[PDB]
Every structure is written in structure tokens, then in C-alpha cells.
Amino acid sequence: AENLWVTVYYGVPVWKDAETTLFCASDAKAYETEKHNVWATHACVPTDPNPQEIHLENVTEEFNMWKNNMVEQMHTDIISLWDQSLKPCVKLTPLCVTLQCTNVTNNITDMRGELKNCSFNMTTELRDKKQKVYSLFYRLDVVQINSNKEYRLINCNTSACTQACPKVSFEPIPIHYCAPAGFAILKCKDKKFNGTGPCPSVSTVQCTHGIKPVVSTQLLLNGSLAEEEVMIRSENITNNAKNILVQFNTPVQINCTRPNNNTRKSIRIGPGQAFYATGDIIGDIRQAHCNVSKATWNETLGKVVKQLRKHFGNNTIIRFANSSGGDLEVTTHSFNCGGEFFYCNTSGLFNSTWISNNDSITLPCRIKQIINMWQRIGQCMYAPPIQGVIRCVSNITGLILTRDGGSTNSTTETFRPGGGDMRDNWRSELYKYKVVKIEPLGVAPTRCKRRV
Amino acid sequence: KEYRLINCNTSACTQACPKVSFEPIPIHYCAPAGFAILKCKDKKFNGTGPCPS
Amino acid sequence: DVLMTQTPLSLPVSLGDQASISCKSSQSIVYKDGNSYLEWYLQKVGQSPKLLIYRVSNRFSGVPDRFSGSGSGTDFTLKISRVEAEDLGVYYCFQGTHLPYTFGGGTKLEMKR
Amino acid sequence: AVGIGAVFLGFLGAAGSTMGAASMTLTVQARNLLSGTVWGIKQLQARVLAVERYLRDQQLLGIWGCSGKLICCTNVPWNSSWSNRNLSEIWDNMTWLQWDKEISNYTQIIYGLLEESQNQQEKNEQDLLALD
Amino acid sequence: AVGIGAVFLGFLGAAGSTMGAASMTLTVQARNLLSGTVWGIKQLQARVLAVERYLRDQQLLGIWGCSGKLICCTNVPWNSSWSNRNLSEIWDNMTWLQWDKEISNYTQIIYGLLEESQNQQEKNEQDLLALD
Amino acid sequence: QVQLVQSGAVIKTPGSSVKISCRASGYNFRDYSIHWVRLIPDKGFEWIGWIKPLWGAVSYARQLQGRVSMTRQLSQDPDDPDWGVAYMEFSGLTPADTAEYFCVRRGSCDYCGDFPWQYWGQGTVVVV
Amino acid sequence: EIVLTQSPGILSLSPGETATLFCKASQGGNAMTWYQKRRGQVPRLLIYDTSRRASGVPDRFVGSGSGTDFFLTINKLDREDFAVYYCQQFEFFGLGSELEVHR
Numbered sequence A: 001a002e003n004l005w006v007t008v009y010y011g012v013p014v015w016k017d018a019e020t021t022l023f024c025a026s027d028a029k030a031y032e033t034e035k036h037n038v039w040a041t042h043a044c045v046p047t048d049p050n051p052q053e054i055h056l057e058n059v060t061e062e063f064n065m066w067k068n069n070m071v072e073q074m075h076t077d078i079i080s081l082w083d084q085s086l087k088p089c090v091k092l093t094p095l096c097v098t099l100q101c102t103n104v105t106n107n108i109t110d111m112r113g114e115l116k117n118c119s120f121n122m123t124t125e126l127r128d129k130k131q132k133v134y135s136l137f138y139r140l141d142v143v144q145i146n147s148n149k150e151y152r153l154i155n156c157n158t159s160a161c162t163q164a165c166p167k168v169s170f171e172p173i174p175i176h177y178c179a180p181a182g183f184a185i186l187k188c189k190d191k192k193f194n195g196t197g198p199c200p201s202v203s204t205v206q207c208t209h210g211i212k213p214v215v216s217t218q219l220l221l222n223g224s225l226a227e228e229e230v231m232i233r234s235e236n237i238t239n240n241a242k243n244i245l246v247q248f249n250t251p252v253q254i255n256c257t258r259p260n261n262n263t264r265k266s267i268r269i270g271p272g273q274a275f276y277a278t279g280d281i282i283g284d285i286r287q288a289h290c291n292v293s294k295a296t297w298n299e300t301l302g303k304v305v306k307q308l309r310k311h312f313g314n315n316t317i318i319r320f321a322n323s324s325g326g327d328l329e330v331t332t333h334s335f336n337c338g339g340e341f342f343y344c345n346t347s348g349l350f351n352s353t354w355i356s357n358n359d360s361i362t363l364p365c366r367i368k369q370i371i372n373m374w375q376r377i378g379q380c381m382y383a384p385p386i387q388g389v390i391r392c393v394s395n396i397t398g399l400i401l402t403r404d405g406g407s408t409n410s411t412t413e414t415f416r417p418g419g420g421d422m423r424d425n426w427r428s429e430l431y432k433y434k435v436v437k438i439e440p441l442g443v444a445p446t447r448c449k450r451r452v
Numbered sequence B: 001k002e003y004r005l006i007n008c009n010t011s012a013c014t015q016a017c018p019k020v021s022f023e024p025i026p027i028h029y030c031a032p033a034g035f036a037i038l039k040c041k042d043k044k045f046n047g048t049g050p051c052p053s
Numbered sequence C: 001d002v003l004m005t006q007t008p009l010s011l012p013v014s015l016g017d018q019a020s021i022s023c024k025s026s027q028s029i030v031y032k033d034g035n036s037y038l039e040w041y042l043q044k045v046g047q048s049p050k051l052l053i054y055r056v057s058n059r060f061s062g063v064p065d066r067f068s069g070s071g072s073g074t075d076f077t078l079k080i081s082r083v084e085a086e087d088l089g090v091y092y093c094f095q096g097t098h099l100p101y102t103f104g105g106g107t108k109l110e111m112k113r
Numbered sequence D, E: 001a002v003g004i005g006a007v008f009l010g011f012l013g014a015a016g017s018t019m020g021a022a023s024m025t026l027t028v029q030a031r032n033l034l035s036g037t038v039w040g041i042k043q044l045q046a047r048v049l050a051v052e053r054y055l056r057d058q059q060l061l062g063i064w065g066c067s068g069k070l071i072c073c074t075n076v077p078w079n080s081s082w083s084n085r086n087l088s089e090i091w092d093n094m095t096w097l098q099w100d101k102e103i104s105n106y107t108q109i110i111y112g113l114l115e116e117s118q119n120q121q122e123k124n125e126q127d128l129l130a131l132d
Numbered sequence F: 001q002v003q004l005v006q007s008g009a010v011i012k013t014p015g016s017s018v019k020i021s022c023r024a025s026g027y028n029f030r031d032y033s034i035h036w037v038r039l040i041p042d043k044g045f046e047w048i049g050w051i052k053p054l055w056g057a058v059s060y061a062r063q064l065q066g067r068v069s070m071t072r073q074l075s076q077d078p079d080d081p082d083w084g085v086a087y088m089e090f091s092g093l094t095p096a097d098t099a100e101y102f103c104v105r106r107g108s109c110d111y112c113g114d115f116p117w118q119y120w121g122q123g124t125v126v127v128v
Numbered sequence G: 001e002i003v004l005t006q007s008p009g010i011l012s013l014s015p016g017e018t019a020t021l022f023c024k025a026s027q028g029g030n031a032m033t034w035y036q037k038r039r040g041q042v043p044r045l046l047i048y049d050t051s052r053r054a055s056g057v058p059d060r061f062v063g064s065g066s067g068t069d070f071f072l073t074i075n076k077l078d079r080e081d082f083a084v085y086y087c088q089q090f091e092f093f094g095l096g097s098e099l100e101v102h103r
């Protein structure tokens, strides 16, 4: 029996790394409130109501979230689907017209604009007639083209923009990723998983956990938080161009609002097309803001400073600065709240210093009605105003940082907020996953023959 | 007087090209693979219940 | 890991009142069966721990009907109808789906005076 | 409780267990390999890619001596330079992931030898039944 | 130089060679038969048509006596009016293209005879194992 | 190909401010970072700052903050979506800043990092 | 910070020979980038990630090394290749190795 005869085996558990498309699976509970309310309530399969992970044993798979392909497929799929949820809505070509604007009725102090009362001609249901109509636009949407002044919208120089139908909600619903046939999805479970390298306790799973898609720049919200302690993640920490993601342990709470009691008003641009304009401000003119608890925020910065001293030496001076500059929605804090896009100045959180040994922070917010997210060539959208005072409450899951330094050996390490690419917001929720391909045909020796 | 069309209050409407006829042509339903289509043949078939042929 | 906590931690309850303790699950506990595999444990001191009920609804044979349990996948609790002296002991919540199997903290029902 | 044995009858549970214990639960990876307007095209294309991969593997298994068998036996001997390890350590110690990365260079040679073996077996069977 | 023998192991190279020499390289036509937004629909439809054709041929081969065999043997005899040519000239002279256009009328008769043969073989096998 | 045209040489006074326009053409400008670097004669190289032109997030060296600002200009017409412009305005000039200023772009490879600099500018000579 | 010492400062050779330039770092575990700069022209990338040549670079520029010792070898010198060579890791540059004609 010194001879060994080769035997094949079909259905052997052994995988090799590969990349493929993944189909999304939204939960069927969103189907109970039907009729296109959020996206992918029609363009998405319902889930298995019985998810079943299968904890493996004595197994080591190398994970690397930075060279992952699933985050890139998600960044493509959200853009393509977000464009697919604007084509039935009304294009706002005819509203791009010369505006005659004045100040809103207010005790103007001679130091702020921030609202404009713009009258303009507009077509009617019939093609022949026309109507004078007034609206209220923000100052970040009108530009003085060169008596009362004479303005135009800012998108008119490059591209007309579809407004969003108010039957379509902007709020996230959890998106699962069920793997197709032939492939599988692994999952790290090590609580001290750095981000790159071996995770010595993996678990295969047929469909991923609840991923709610938020859109935010300075500090990501409602993001699955780590369990044992606050963690930081990077690719090369001694590199400057790569962001330094941070995931919290305790969710610090933020409250945001808009005190102006609006009045939504319908204008018929064309037959079958209606335009929604900010009609009147009853109540009082009060600026939008956000509040976090000062004590918990000082404690949470104490935790992240305790964590950052490991990678940099125990005797360094970690200090936090505000953003260096750039466009609007990378310096300020961008998010959506009830279907209306805020931009909140965050210099009031990011100023401190840290040496080796009740109230609440207010921070102002500015609002745009038109938005250009993902920075395409000729697509913006006009987010319509919403009736009444709105507010929304959110847990802060983590924040995105950025180190800087040129030379001259100083002990300080100034950190500033980041943003930039939208993909970093997804790399804080697809870090523990990896897609694999089954190769079920393996071959091995044993003692047997086949009988002729 | 001074009139307008009735659809102008809500929606403009595509007219039908006169190359497109409206008349019916018979539509058959061939079953796909794996399935089959049964057919009652009982002349006294009420609408609900067993058809024994 | 799917560690749990127990609210509250100790209830001295008189002989003949209703006691109710909850365990909250971080992740959902659903198997391919559909029944949420959670067990309720009692341990009289210096012994082996028993089983109070099964999943939420079924009951361990050799246990009286002074125990009931409720839950809807996410957060679970009990209701004890009548209190005895043998009902002294340490209680636990146990999971049966994911590895490693987690436990609750442990509650000690006491006497009132 | 579910039980730890439900891990081994589960999908891909034997991936860390030894080679002598994955052969009992080897059919679950075989069974869960097949079944499981732009989005319709993506999902349709992925599903037909999966069934083309399964059909390619069944055709490559059928031109050997085992068209419908999970376990098989052949008639070609192991060159000792392939893995030079005895029977007890490659069926009680090693895992399949480690075994796949120890013979990864020699696999096309094995497939060619199996094709030659089945070809000569077919012509020998035809020569045996030709005389009757 | 590549070599002229790489013609015969290539795809469809034996198409001009004799019938007695195409059976050795007969598996290449078997292997290259399967694997290989409007454009996505056209390419997807062509690929599923190819796998439906392959699966139809495998089902029509499986209801005979050879489910996973490239070469096969049956139990029905040749009516002499089918081709009336002896063994040496139809395995050393003729090509398969010429053979296909000499029995093109009689093929459905052959397929019906094979179906009857496998049906009676199944009932005879059931009668043989019924007595045990 | 990839081209990085700059502006010509310039003579400035101490206390003034200089603006240098690095025009980039040949690739998608909304993707890859732009870095700025300066050759001081008989002192070596020194990094200045980077800019990501998708939004314009910038970073600067520690010993140059409060002195340098960097902006960008994208291309908005869909007929030429590739070209783009970077702007560096360097203020607080001293006679120590008599140097040669370069704008660079990343390596184009998927294996190379961020700081390996493949494509370079022609060179702006700044004399204070 | 990171200090890069680059030596030899001045290397005097004749064409056809082999040049060796070594860059010492302070921290270890990173890559190293090698630039060529001729006199009065635009600088040029030679080596990125410590062993890979740039596009349009002949194979006679070989680089290796690990940890702190980083080596750049230029076998089979040319008349054109006499220039200044820099080692850049991240944003901390070297100072320069000048390659001079010997006679």
C-alpha cells in the first residue's frame, strides 16, 4: 500500500479571493408603508427573515478594508440609484429666470442677509398668459447679476436641475447585502480588529447586517459603534493624505433644528407641473443650530485622545483645530434632517489642547436649498421646503480626522476634520466584511481503486 | 367667449400616431417551461368549483 | 459578540407577589427554525443550575406553573406568579444561536422584612 | 440552545476542521452552490454566471470517471514530488485551505493525467466489448 | 514552431480527418461547447440559449443508457437499409460531415429505437431486482 | 498624456503676495490630488500642501500656516470635463522665499501611494 | 519627524562603472522614493515603493533595501545619467547626492 491513487472531491470547503456584484436586500417592514416613499422599496428583494451566521473554528483569513471592492460597488450603486430616483420628477428649466429681489421684512441691523424675497414672472397652465409671483430664497442660492437689485439662481450658469418629489423621502432604510450563489461573505468578529491583517475569529454569513445609508462629512452619524473601547483606524498612520477614521464606544447625542415656521406654497410652472416655494415666515426669524452635551463631548474627546497617544508616543500634545478651508460642504458639517440639508459650523467642538496629564455647546447652521452632492457635471437638485418647524435627533457614531505636518519636529499633532471622498463614510461599516469565491473541486490522495 | 382644453388643468397629453391602429388582434398565452395550463371543458361550468373534464 | 445585561439585579419580593426581570439582546436571536433560542436559568445556591422554561413558550418538565416568559425577538422578560422559599437563587438569561453562548449577569431574589 | 453539531451540518462549517472530517458534511457545499430594470439585468447576469460555473464544473467532472459522484476513485498514481507527505498527516492534521496552497502548481498536470486515464479507459472498454 | 499535432488537439481540428481518428480528440468539441443595456440583454440571451442547448442535449443523452459517457454502447441493431456499408470504409475512409449527410433521413427512427431500448431495459432491470 | 502647465516667472517685493496657477490637462481633474513643493537653492526640498479637487479639502505644512492658501477651479462644461486649474497664493513673502515652486500630481498606478510624484510642473521661479 | 541622511554626498566616477547611494532613515517599516534631477531641468521619478521603476526608466536603475538601509544601484553609467539624486519618504526629503565625472 505504498502506492496512493488520486481521488477527486466535489463540494470541498475551500475559498479563494474574488470580486463580484452583490444584490441588495431591504427589509419587508418598509413594504408595509408602500408606494415609492423611500428608494428601493420596489427595486430591491425582501430579505430572509431568518439570518443565520455560521461561526467557523481554527481559521485565519486576511482582511483589508482599504483595498476592499464592496465599498466601491456600494458607492457606485447609491449614485446610480439616486439618479434613478429623480427621473420621474419635474425638471425646473422654466424657473431659471431674472429675479427682482428685496430684503425680507425684518429689523435689518446692517449685519446679515440670509433670506431674500424675490418676485419674478412665471408661466401658467396656459402657454400664453403669465403671472407675477414671489418666493423666499436663501442667500446661498441667488447671485447678483449686473432701484431694487436684480438676481438669478446660481445653477442657471451651468445646468437646470430636477427638484425632488415630496412623495420621495430621503431617510435611510437599512440595506443588507445577500451574497449570490457560488460566493460567500465572511465577517470578522475580533473586537480588537485593527482594520488590516488577520482576524483569527471569522464567521461566514449569507447576508449582511443592517446598514443605514446616511450622508455626512465632518462626523458620521448613526454608525454602528464599537463595543469594548473607542477605536481608531488608518492605512499608514504616518501618511498625511489618508484619513484617520475614529469609531466611538459611547454615542454622543446631537440635537438639530430649524426654528423658522415656513409655509409651503404651490406654483404651477406648467400643466401637470407644480413648484413648491417658501411662501411666508410666520412666527419669527431665528437661525438654525445644533446642540451637543458639553460634558459628554469633553469625555469623548478624552477617550479619543487616550487612544491616539498609543500610535504617537505617550508624551505629545494632541490638539484639535477647525477645518483648513475649501468648498462649503467639506469644511462645515453636512447632513439631512427631515428632508432639508443643513450645513453646521463645527469650530465650537474642535478647539482644545491635551497635555500628558449641564451646559450644551451651540453651533450655528446654514441651509442651502439647492445641493450638488457627489459633484457631477450638470446635475444638482432643488430640495423643496417643508411645512413647519422640524427637528431631528441623532447618535454620533464616529468622526473623520486628518493629521498634518511638514517638518520642524514639534511635539504637537494637530488634528482637523476631513470629508472629501464620500467612500470613507462607507468604510466604517463594511470594514468587517469580505467576499470570497468557492472552488469546490479539490483533489487528494487516498488508498482506493476503481473496479474495471 | 374664451375657452381652454380640459386636460390643461392637470397634464399635457400625448396624441396617438395614426400609424398605430387601435383594433384588437388575438393574444394567445403560451405557458413557459416547467408549468402548464389547464382548461375546463364542462359546458355547465358555474365559475367556481370542480370541473370534471 | 452578543453579550447581554439584566435589568434589575436583585429584587427582594414578598411571598405572593409578581416579579419581572428583563434581558435585552444586542443582536436579534433568530435561527433558521424561527424560534428564538433563549433559555431561562435558575440556580439554587450550592447546586447545579436548573432550567426554568425553554425558548419563550415551552417549559422544562419537572417545573411548576408559577413561571411565565415573554418577548418579541429583541428584549425578553419573565413574570413569576407566586413566590416561594425555593425561588431563592440566582437567575440567568442564556442564548443558543451564536457562538460563543452569552449569559446574563444573574439576579438574586430575596426576602422582605 | 441550537447545538455545536449544527455548525458542522451548516454551510462551510468544516472549513477549519480536518480533512478526515469534512468528507461527511461535504454535500452542503455542493447543494448551496446552485440554488441560493438595470437591477434585473445585474441579478439575472449574476445568476446565469453561477449556473454556468456549476455546469462547467459538472462537465469537467463528467469527462473523468465520476459523472454523478461526490467521492471518486481513479487510475493514475501520485508522483512523489507532488506533496511527499504520508497518509496520516494529510487526513488527520491538515485543513483543506492549507492543502490547496501546497499543490497549487501541479493541478493542471493532474487534470491532464485524469483526462488521459479516462480516454484510455474508454478505448480499453471498447476493445473489451468489441470481441463479444 | 508550434507543431501540427496541436491542430488535432485544437478545437474542431479533426473535422477533415477520418472517423477513426476523431474519437481520440472528441472531448475538445464537448468542452468548448459550454464555456466559451440592450447589448447586455443580447449577450445574456445568447448565453442562456447556449446553456439551454447544452442542457437539452445532456437530457436527450441521459434518457439513453449513457448519462455521462462520451462513447457509448446500446442494444438495438442496424437495419441494413440505413447505410449498407461495411466497417472498414466507415471508420478509415469517410469523414463525419459526409456521414451526417448519408443518414440524415433516418435519425428520428434511431432516437425512437434508443428510447424504446432504454425503456425495456429499465423494466427488465426492475423485473430482475423484483424477485430478490 | 498628462500635462501640468504653470504661469511664468515673477518678481515680487517683500511683504507682497504671489498667485501661481497650475493648470492640469489630460486626465479627470476631479479625482487625483495635487501637491505643491518648493526648491530652495542650497537648502533642499520642502513640502507645502496638498489639495483634493473633488471638493477642495486642503492641508498645509505646520511652519507655513497663516501664510499660504490654495484654491481650485473645476471645469463645468460637459464637452471638456477633464481639464482643471489649481491656485496657490503664498503670502508674507521674505527674501528667504526666493525659490522655485512646483505643482505635482500623484502616480497613476493602482499600486503606487500618494506621495510618489510622477508628473511635474514646468517650474515657477519666484524672486523676492 | 523623519530625518533622511543621504550618503555619499559627492560621488566621482567614470562611465561604465556602478554607482551605489544609500539613504538612512529614522523610523522603519516604510517605503522609499528615489528621484533624479539633472542640472537646470525638471526633476524625474526613478523608484517608487523601494524597488519598482517608473515609466520610461531603463532597467539599469535598481533599488532595494529594507528597514533603515535603502540602496540605489546604477550599474552601467551613461554620460547623460550624471545628475543629482534625492530620497523622499513621505514629505521629508533628503539633501542630495551629486554624481561627478572623474578624471
Ligand SMILES: *[C@@H]1O[C@H](CO)[C@@H](O[C@@H]2O[C@H](CO)[C@@H](O[C@@H]3O[C@H](CO[C@H]4O[C@H](CO)[C@@H](O)[C@H](O[C@H]5O[C@H](CO)[C@@H](O)[C@H](O)[C@@H]5O[C@H]5O[C@H](CO)[C@@H](O)[C@H](O)[C@@H]5O)[C@@H]4O)[C@@H](O)[C@H](O[C@H]4O[C@H](CO)[C@@H](O)[C@H](O)[C@@H]4O[C@H]4O[C@H](CO)[C@@H](O)[C@H](O)[C@@H]4O)[C@@H]3O)[C@H](O)[C@H]2NC(C)=O)[C@H](O)[C@H]1NC(C)=O
Pocket: A037, A166, A169, A170, A171, A172, A214, A221, A222, A335, A336, A337, A338, A339, A386, A387, A392, A393, A394, A395
Ligand atoms: C438617525 O436615526 C434617528 C432614528 O430614526 C433619526 O431620527 C428620525 O428621523 C426621521 C426623519 O426621517 C423622523 O421621522 C419623521 O418623524 C416625524 C415625527 O412624527 C413621528 O413621530 C411621532 C412621535 O415620535 C409619532 O407619534 C408619529 O407616528 C407614530 O404613530 C403612527 C400611527 O399611525 C405610526 O404609523 C408611526 O410609525 C409612529 O409610530 C410610533 O409608535 C409605534 C408604536 O405604535 C412605534 O413602534 C414607532 O417606533 C413610533 O414610535 C410620527 O411617525 C414625522 O412628521 C415624519 O413623517 C412625515 O415625513 C415622512 C417623510 O419622511 C412622510 O412619509 C410622513 O407621511 C410625514 O409626512 C407628512 O406629514 C408632513 C407634516 O404634516 C407633511 O409636511 C408631508 O407633506 C406629509 O403630508 C417622519 O416620520 C423620526 O421621527 C426620527 N426619530 C425620532 C425618534 O425622532 C435620525 O434622522 C437619523 N439621523 C439622520 C442624519 O438621518
Ligand SMILES: *[C@@H]1O[C@H](CO)[C@@H](O[C@@H]2O[C@H](CO)[C@@H](O[C@@H]3O[C@H](CO[C@H]4O[C@H](CO)[C@@H](O)[C@H](O)[C@@H]4O)[C@@H](O)[C@H](O[C@H]4O[C@H](CO)[C@@H](O)[C@H](O)[C@@H]4O[C@H]4O[C@H](CO)[C@@H](O)[C@H](O)[C@@H]4O)[C@@H]3O)[C@H](O)[C@H]2NC(C)=O)[C@H](O)[C@H]1NC(C)=O
Pocket: A103, A104, A105, A117, A119, A134, A279, A280, A281
Ligand atoms: C415678500 O415680499 C412680498 C412683495 O414682494 C410681500 O407681499 C406683500 O406683502 C404686503 C404686506 O407686507 C401686502 O400689502 C398688504 O396687502 C393686504 C392685502 O391686500 C388685499 O386687500 C386690499 C384692500 O384694498 C385689496 O385692494 C387687494 O387687492 C388685496 O385683495 C392689504 O390688506 C394691506 O393693507 C393693510 O396694510 C396697510 C399698510 O400700510 C395699511 O395702511 C392698511 O390700512 C391695511 O391695514 C388694514 O388691514 C390689516 C390686515 O387686515 C390690519 O392689520 C390693519 O389693522 C388694517 O385694518 C397691505 O396693502 C402686499 O399686498 C403683498 N403683495 C403681494 C403681491 O402679495 C410679502 O409679504 C413679503 N414676505 C415676507 C416674508 O417678507
Ligand SMILES: *[C@@H]1O[C@H](CO)[C@@H](O[C@@H]2O[C@H](CO)[C@@H](O[C@@H]3O[C@H](CO[C@H]4O[C@H](CO)[C@@H](O)[C@H](O)[C@@H]4O)[C@@H](O)[C@H](O[C@H]4O[C@H](CO)[C@@H](O)[C@H](O)[C@@H]4O)[C@@H]3O)[C@H](O)[C@H]2NC(C)=O)[C@H](O)[C@H]1NC(C)=O
Pocket: A194, A195, A196, A197, A198, A233, A234, A235, A236, A237, G028, G029
Ligand atoms: C493594525 O494592526 C496590525 C496588527 O494586527 C499591524 O500590522 C503589523 O504591525 C506590526 C507592528 O505594529 C508590524 O510588525 C513589525 O514588522 C517588522 C518587519 O518584520 C516582520 O516581517 C519580516 C518579513 O518581512 C519577518 O521576518 C519578521 O519576523 C517580522 O514578522 C519588524 O521588524 C518590527 O519589529 C519591531 O519590534 C522590534 C522589537 O520589538 C524592534 O526592534 C523593531 O525596530 C520594530 O520596532 C515589527 O514587528 C507588522 O509588519 C504589521 N503587519 C502588517 C501586515 O501590516 C498594522 O500595522 C496596524 N495598522 C494600523 C493602520 O494601525
Ligand SMILES: *[C@@H]1O[C@H](CO)[C@@H](O[C@@H]2O[C@H](CO)[C@@H](O[C@@H]3O[C@H](CO)[C@@H](O)[C@H](O[C@H]4O[C@H](CO)[C@@H](O)[C@H](O)[C@@H]4O)[C@@H]3O)[C@H](O)[C@H]2NC(C)=O)[C@H](O)[C@H]1NC(C)=O
Pocket: A107, A108, A109
Ligand atoms: C432693531 O434693530 C436695531 C439695529 O440697529 C436696534 O437698534 C440698536 O439697539 C441697541 C440696543 O437696543 C442700541 O444700543 C446699543 O447697544 C448697547 C446698549 O448698552 C451699547 O453698548 C451700544 O453702544 C455701542 O454702539 C453705538 C452705536 O453703534 C456706539 O455709538 C457706542 O459707542 C457703542 O459702540 C448701543 O448703545 C443701538 O444704539 C441701536 N442702534 C441704533 C442705530 O439706534 C433696535 O433696538 C432693534 N429694535 C427692535 C424692536 O428689535
Ligand SMILES: *[C@@H]1O[C@H](CO)[C@@H](O[C@@H]2O[C@H](CO)[C@@H](O[C@@H]3O[C@H](CO)[C@@H](O)[C@H](O)[C@@H]3O)[C@H](O)[C@H]2NC(C)=O)[C@H](O)[C@H]1NC(C)=O
Pocket: A322, A323, A324, A325, A331, A332, A345, A347
Ligand atoms: C477656523 O477658525 C478660524 C479662527 O479661529 C477662522 O478664521 C476666521 O475666519 C473669518 C472668515 O472666514 C474671519 O472673519 C472676518 O470677517 C470680517 C467681516 O466679514 C472681515 O472683514 C475679515 O477680513 C474676516 O474675513 C475671522 O477674522 C477669522 N479669524 C481669525 C483669527 O483669523 C476660520 O474661519 C475657521 N474655519 C472655519 C471653516 O470656520
Ligand SMILES: *[C@@H]1O[C@H](CO)[C@@H](O[C@@H]2O[C@H](CO)[C@@H](O[C@@H]3O[C@H](CO)[C@@H](O)[C@H](O)[C@@H]3O)[C@H](O)[C@H]2NC(C)=O)[C@H](O)[C@H]1NC(C)=O
Pocket: A347, A348, A351, A352
Ligand atoms: C476655542 O476654545 C477657546 C478656549 O480654550 C476659546 O477661547 C475663549 O474665547 C472667549 C471669547 O472668544 C473668551 O471669553 C472672554 O475672553 C476675554 C478675553 O478677551 C476674557 O477676559 C473674558 O472674561 C471672557 O472669558 C474665553 O475666556 C476664552 N477661553 C479661555 C479659556 O480663556 C475660543 O473662543 C474657542 N474658539 C472658538 C472659535 O469658539
Ligand SMILES: *[C@@H]1O[C@H](CO)[C@@H](O[C@@H]2O[C@H](CO)[C@@H](O[C@@H]3O[C@H](CO)[C@@H](O)[C@H](O)[C@@H]3O)[C@H](O)[C@H]2NC(C)=O)[C@H](O)[C@H]1NC(C)=O
Pocket: A251, A393, A394, A395, C075
Ligand atoms: C442611539 O443609541 C442609544 C444607545 O445609547 C439608544 O438609546 C436606547 O435605545 C433603546 C432601544 O432603541 C431603548 O430601549 C427602550 O427601552 C424602553 C423601556 O420601556 C422600551 O419601551 C423600548 O421599546 C426600548 O426597548 C433605550 O431606552 C435607549 N436608551 C436611552 C438612554 O434612551 C437610542 O435609541 C439610539 N437612537 C437614537 C435616535 O438616539
Ligand SMILES: *[C@@H]1O[C@H](CO)[C@@H](O[C@@H]2O[C@H](CO)[C@@H](O[C@@H]3O[C@H](CO)[C@@H](O)[C@H](O)[C@@H]3O)[C@H](O)[C@H]2NC(C)=O)[C@H](O)[C@H]1NC(C)=O
Pocket: D101, D102, D103, D104, D105
Ligand atoms: C510553485 O512553483 C513555483 C516555481 O518554482 C515556486 O516559486 C518559487 O518559490 C521559491 C520560494 O519557495 C522562490 O525562491 C525565492 O526566490 C527569491 C528570488 O530573489 C529569493 O530571494 C528567495 O530567498 C527564495 O529563494 C523561487 O524563486 C520561485 N520560483 C520562481 C521561478 O520565481 C512556488 O514556490 C511553488 N509553489 C509552492 C507552494 O511551493
Ligand SMILES: *[C@@H]1O[C@H](CO)[C@@H](O[C@@H]2O[C@H](CO)[C@@H](O[C@@H]3O[C@H](CO)[C@@H](O)[C@H](O)[C@@H]3O)[C@H](O)[C@H]2NC(C)=O)[C@H](O)[C@H]1NC(C)=O
Pocket: E101, E102, E103, E104, E105
Ligand atoms: C432521404 O429521403 C428522401 C425521400 O425519398 C430522399 O429524397 C429523394 O431523393 C431522390 C434523389 O436521390 C429524388 O429523386 C429525384 O427526383 C426528381 C423529381 O423530378 C428527378 O427529376 C431526379 O432525376 C431524381 O430521380 C426523389 O424524388 C426524392 N424523394 C422525394 C419524395 O422527393 C433523399 O434523397 C434521402 N436522402 C438521402 C441522403 O438519400
Ligand SMILES: *[C@@H]1O[C@H](CO)[C@@H](O[C@@H]2O[C@H](CO)[C@@H](O)[C@H](O)[C@H]2NC(C)=O)[C@H](O)[C@H]1NC(C)=O
Pocket: A102, A103, A108, A110, A111, A112, A113
Ligand atoms: C437689504 O440689505 C442690504 C444689506 O444690508 C442693504 O444694503 C446695504 O447695507 C449696508 C449695511 O451693511 C448699508 O451700509 C448700505 O447703505 C446698504 N445699501 C443701501 C443702498 O441701502 C439694503 O439697504 C437692504 N435693503 C434693500 C431695500 O435692499
Ligand SMILES: *[C@@H]1O[C@H](CO)[C@@H](O[C@@H]2O[C@H](CO)[C@@H](O)[C@H](O)[C@H]2NC(C)=O)[C@H](O)[C@H]1NC(C)=O
Pocket: A143, A157, A158, F076, F077
Ligand atoms: C458660473 O457662474 C458663477 C456665478 O457667477 C461663476 O462664478 C464666479 O466667477 C467669477 C469670475 O469667473 C468669480 O469672480 C466669482 O468669484 C465666481 N463666484 C462663485 C460663487 O464661484 C462661474 O465662473 C460661472 N462659470 C461658467 C463656466 O460660466
Ligand SMILES: *[C@@H]1O[C@H](CO)[C@@H](O[C@@H]2O[C@H](CO)[C@@H](O)[C@H](O)[C@H]2NC(C)=O)[C@H](O)[C@H]1NC(C)=O
Pocket: A253, A254, A255, A291, A292, A293, A360, A393
Ligand atoms: C436633545 O433633545 C432631547 C429631546 O428633547 C433631550 O432629551 C430630554 O432632555 C430633557 C432635558 O433637556 C430631559 O428632561 C428628558 O428626560 C430627555 N428625554 C429623553 C428621551 O432623553 C436631550 O437632552 C437633548 N440633548 C441635549 C444635549 O440637549
Ligand SMILES: *[C@@H]1O[C@H](CO)[C@@H](O[C@@H]2O[C@H](CO)[C@@H](O)[C@H](O)[C@H]2NC(C)=O)[C@H](O)[C@H]1NC(C)=O
Pocket: B009, B010
Ligand atoms: C381642474 O380643472 C377643472 C375644470 O375647471 C376643475 O373642475 C371644476 O372645479 C370646480 C371647482 O373646483 C367645480 O365647480 C366644477 O364643477 C369642476 N368641473 C368639472 C368638470 O369637474 C378642477 O377642480 C381642477 N382641478 C385642479 C386640481 O385644479
Ligand SMILES: *[C@@H]1O[C@H](CO)[C@@H](O)[C@H](O)[C@H]1NC(C)=O
Pocket: A298, A299, A352
Ligand atoms: C475637559 O475636562 C478635562 C478634565 O479636567 C480638562 O483637562 C479639559 O481641559 C476639559 N476641556 C474642556 C473643553 O472643558
Ligand SMILES: *[C@@H]1O[C@H](CO)[C@@H](O)[C@H](O)[C@H]1NC(C)=O
Pocket: A314
Ligand atoms: C505609554 O503609556 C501608557 C500609560 O497608560 C502605558 O500603558 C504604555 O505601556 C506606554 N507605552 C510606551 C511605549 O511607553
Ligand SMILES: *[C@@H]1O[C@H](CO)[C@@H](O)[C@H](O)[C@H]1NC(C)=O
Pocket: D085, D086, D087, D088, D089
Ligand atoms: C508516516 O505516518 C506516521 C503515522 O502513521 C507518522 O508518524 C510519520 O511521521 C509519517 N512519516 C512521514 C515521513 O511523514
